[PDB]
Amino acid sequence: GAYRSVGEWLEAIKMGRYTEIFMENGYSSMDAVAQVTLEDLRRLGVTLVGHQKKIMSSLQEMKVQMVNG
Amino acid sequence: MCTNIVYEWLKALQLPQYAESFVDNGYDDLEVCKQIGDPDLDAIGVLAPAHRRRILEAVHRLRE
């Protein structure tokens, strides 16, 4: 909830390399990104397991902040 | 409140200098490290052949 764009969120978790890929494939606002699954990541070309973990862990961290707030 | 396990592991391999890059790339526990191959080392930035071989040999040992 505290990021202006998907690009800004990705750069905050050191995953900025995926920004273009997310925007081009239609995961283009913070709302679109919250429904992303591990399979969605795989189909977007995020095949490195550590990067999948980074991204899925952050998506979950952001959900936790929202349910708790 | 407890040492990061990937730091501890790389210390045991006498390659502690990569620990922060491992963790920053999401290789933050031994379950993830078990899946490491050449693309993962490339992204992390482990380039010296001896170090690459040492980590991949270690990864093989985690999968036993």
Numbering used by the authors:
A (entry chain A): 804 to 872
B (entry chain B): 1 to 64
Tell me, in the authors' exact words, what the paper reports.
The Eph (erythropoietin-producing hepatocyte) transmembrane receptor tyrosine kinase superfamily, with its first member identified years ago, contains 14 members in mammals and is the largest among all receptor tyrosine kinase families. In this study, we performed systematic biochemical and structural studies of the bindings of three SAM domains, two from previously identified Eph-binding proteins (SHIP2 and Odin) and one from a new Eph-binding protein discovered in this study (SAMD5), to the SAM domains from every Eph receptor.
Surprisingly, although the amino acid sequence of SAMD5 SAM can be aligned well (the key binding residues in particular) with the SAM domain sequences of SHIP2 and Odin (top), SAMD5 bound to EphA5-8 and EphB1-4 SAM domains with strong affinities but only weakly to EphA1/2 SAM domains. The most prominent difference is that the EphA5/SAMD5 SAM-SAM does not contain the π-π stacking observed in the EphA2/SHIP2 and EphA6/Odin complexes. The backbone amine of Gly853A5 forms a strong hydrogen bond with Tyr27SAMD5 sidechain hydroxyl group. This hydrogen bond brings the α2-α3 loop of SAMD5 very close to α5 of EphA5, and the site has no room to accommodate any residues with side chains, further highlighting the importance of a Gly at this position in the Eph SAM domains. To our surprise, substitution of Tyr27SAMD5 with Phe completely eliminated SAMD5’s binding to EphA5, indicating the critical role of the Gly853A5-Tyr27SAMD5 hydrogen binding in addition to their steric role. Our crystal structure of the EphA5/SAMD5 complex can explain why SAMD5 does not bind to EphA1-4, EphA10, and EphB6.
